Amino acid sequence: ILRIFKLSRHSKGLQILGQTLKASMRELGLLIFFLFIGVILFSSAVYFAEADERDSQFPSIPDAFW
Amino acid sequence: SSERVVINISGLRFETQLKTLAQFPETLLGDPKKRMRYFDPLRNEYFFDRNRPSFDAILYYYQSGGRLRRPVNVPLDIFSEEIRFYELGEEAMEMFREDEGYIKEEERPLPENEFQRQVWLLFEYPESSGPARIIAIVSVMVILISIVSFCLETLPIFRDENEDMHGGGVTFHTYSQSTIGYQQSTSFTDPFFIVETLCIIWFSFEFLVRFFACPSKAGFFTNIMNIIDIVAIIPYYVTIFLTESNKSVLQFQNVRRVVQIFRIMRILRIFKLSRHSKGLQILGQTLKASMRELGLLIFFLFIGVILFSSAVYFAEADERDSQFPSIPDAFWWAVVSMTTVGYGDMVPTTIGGKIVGSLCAIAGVLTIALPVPVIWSNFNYFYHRET
Amino acid sequence: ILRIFKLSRHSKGLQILGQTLKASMRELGLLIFFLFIGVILFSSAVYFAEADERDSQFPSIPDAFWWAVVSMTTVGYGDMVPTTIGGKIVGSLCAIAGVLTIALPVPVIWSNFNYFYHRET
Numbered sequence: 301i302l303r304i305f306k307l308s309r310h311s312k313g314l315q316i317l318g319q320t321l322k323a324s325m326r327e328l329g330l331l332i333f334f335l336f337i338g339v340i341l342f343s344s345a346v347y348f349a350e351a352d353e354r355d356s357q358f359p360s361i362p363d364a365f366w
Numbered sequence: 367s368s369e370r371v372v373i374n375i376s377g378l379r380f381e382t383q384l385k386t387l388a389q390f391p392e393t394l395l396g397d398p399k400k401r402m403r404y405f406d407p408l409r410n411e412y413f414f415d416r417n418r419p420s421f422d423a424i425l426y427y428y429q430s431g432g433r434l435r436r437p438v439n440v441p442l443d444i445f446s447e448e449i450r451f452y453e454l455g456e457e458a459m460e461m462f463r464e465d466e467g468y469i470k471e472e473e474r475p476l477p478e479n480e481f482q483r484q485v486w487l488l489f490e491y492p493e494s495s496g497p498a499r500i501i502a503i504v505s506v507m508v509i510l511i512s513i514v515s516f517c518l519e520t521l522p523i524f525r526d527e528n529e530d531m532h533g534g535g536v537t538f539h540t541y542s543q544s545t546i547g548y549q550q551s552t553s554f555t556d557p558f559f560i561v562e563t564l565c566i567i568w569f570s571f572e573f574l575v576r577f578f579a580c581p582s583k584a585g586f587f588t589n590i591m592n593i594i595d596i597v598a599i600i601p602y603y604v605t606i607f608l609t610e611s612n613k614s615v616l617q618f619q620n621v622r623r624v625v626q627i628f629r630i631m632r633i634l635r636i637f638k639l640s641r642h643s644k645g646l647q648i649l650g651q652t653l654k655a656s657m658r659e660l661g662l663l664i665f666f667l668f669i670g671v672i673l674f675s676s677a678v679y680f681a682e683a684d685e686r687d688s689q690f691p692s693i694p695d696a697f698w699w700a701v702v703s704m705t706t707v708g709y710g711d712m713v714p715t716t717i718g719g720k721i722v723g724s725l726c727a728i729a730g731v732l733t734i735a736l737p738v739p740v741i742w743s744n745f746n747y748f749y750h751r752e753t
Numbered sequence: 754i755l756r757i758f759k760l761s762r763h764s765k766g767l768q769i770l771g772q773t774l775k776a777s778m779r780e781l782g783l784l785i786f787f788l789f790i791g792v793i794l795f796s797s798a799v800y801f802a803e804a805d806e807r808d809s810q811f812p813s814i815p816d817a818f819w820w821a822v823v824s825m826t827t828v829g830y831g832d833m834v835p836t837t838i839g840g841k842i843v844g845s846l847c848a849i850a851g852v853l854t855i856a857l858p859v860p861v862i863w864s865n866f867n868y869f870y871h872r873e874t
């Protein structure tokens with residue numbers, strides 16, 4: 301499916317978005333990290349919060365990552 | 367005196383009264399001896415072969431009696447040089463910076479004692495030694511491991527294999543283990559207890575080493591980083607204390623809620639990474655700044671949940687299948703709708719309930735939207751204030 | 754429940770949001786109107802798009818008004834949803850549109866609000 305990116309040779313826009321990411325990597329990075337901290341943290345509390353219910357939809361903490 | 371003084375800045379002519387300059391006599395212009403060097407007796411003026419735009423601010427500083435505002439058109443580095451040049455003094459300079467948004471970092475306390483300095487440097491500056499850096503990695507590795515381990519403790523493949531995994535009974539060992547997350551034994555049979563103890567040994571180690579190698583023991587619990595360091599170990603020791611003080615099934619059962627609470631507190635160890643993350647720190651400062659807006663967002667949201675969850679309730683109250691039991695129940699719906707998450711586990715069925723619904727959405731879209739600008743700012747500040 | 758607004762006498766913020774709305778009414782107005790145009794239009798296409806299916810979740814066009822809003826505000830409960838390739842193409846658009854419609858007043862409010870706010874605190 302990466303063949304989709306072959307269009308970038310004929311798209312300025314694709315290219316512009318291309319350069320736009322490369323520049324932003326650091327912020328684009330933090331967004332991921334912050335999000336990570338927040339998933340582990342939140343998915344973790346919700347798990348225990350529902351752990352004593354007989355119908356917890358959260359099986360394990362890594363499950364609630366979703 | 368009102369005798370008039372002409373100061374020629376690279377051709378741009380300025381005039382003032384001598385008493386305006388005399389006002390501050392420590393300065394170049396205010397001191398006859400210092401400005402003498404620049405006097406042109408042929409033209410009766412002091413000449414400076416210097417940047418032009420900066421001057422008014424410099425002169426206005428005398429005329430205003432102290433106001434030193436940098437012109438909008440003048441770069442901060444050129445202006446500050448000009449200030450340095452004209453010898454306006456350290457006070458004016460500081461005020462200027464402060465008003466310019468630069469906060470003095472003051473100075474960092476120093477150990478003096480050769481040993482503490484020797485140690486403190488590789489426990490707070492990875493910079494200080496290649497070894498100091500090595501420690502840092504280990505600290506990050508241990509933190510990451512403590513997280514992965516804490517999480518795996520909840521995986522059914524592991525928790526679900528126990529002496530009463532098929533509903534058979536409760537065993538005090540099984541019951542405590544389940545609550546705690548691991549088996550606390552001297553035997554050290556349970557791998558989870560092993561990893562946790564190892565991790566907490568290190569964490570305990572860092573905290574101790576920092577508390578005895580730090581220059582000041584007074585500004586120690588003021589620092590949020592140290593607080594984090596402590597919080598990261600408090601659960602472990604408190605669990606031990608609690609279990610050994612209630613070594614009976616009924617006793618434990620009577621303190622289980624607290625044990626559970628500490629178990630959840632263990633996840634705060636995540637924040638230990640903030641000592642090694644600039645970003646975490648930048649987000650850290652970013653929140654503290656925004657609290658007021660971050661506050662209102664909460665309050666506005668509160669008003670909106672109570673209000674909206676309230677109308678939707680009554681709107682669906684006469685239906686035999688209202689998904690909204692009570693008004694406080696629909697608090698859940700309101701939030702989920704306003705944050706546009708919209709699970710769908712609750713939902714109005716009535717034309718009345720749906721009109722509320724629509725609004726409730728459109729509102730949350732706009733409420734939520736407000737703090738955004740604020741944060742981008744404080745954050746975009748503290749960020750470009752490092753990187 | 755309006756008694757909640759009694760707190761506005763003791764809240765600057767409530768007051769600031771208060772003034773912020775009054776100012777924005779015109780934009781706050783258009784947002785509503787644009788949204789209206791978009792619901793009628795979108796809820797209308799999705800209806801017909803699913804009309805020939807024996808399990809259309811959209812009974813009438815005014816019924817799908819609900820779907821439209823929920824989709825445009827991206828809440829997306831899921832209590833109603835197109836099943837057809839036609840209904841889904843409308844669906845997609847209907848979303849992307851609401852994302853952009855909704856987005857417009859935002860700048861306005863930040864302003865009026867950011868004004869009245871720093872005009873006190």
Ligand SMILES: [K+]
Pocket residue numbers: 705706707826827828
């Ligand atoms: K959404």
Ligand SMILES: [K+]
Pocket residue numbers: 706707708827828829
């Ligand atoms: K959603």
Ligand SMILES: [K+]
Pocket residue numbers: 706707708709827828829830
């Ligand atoms: K949804």
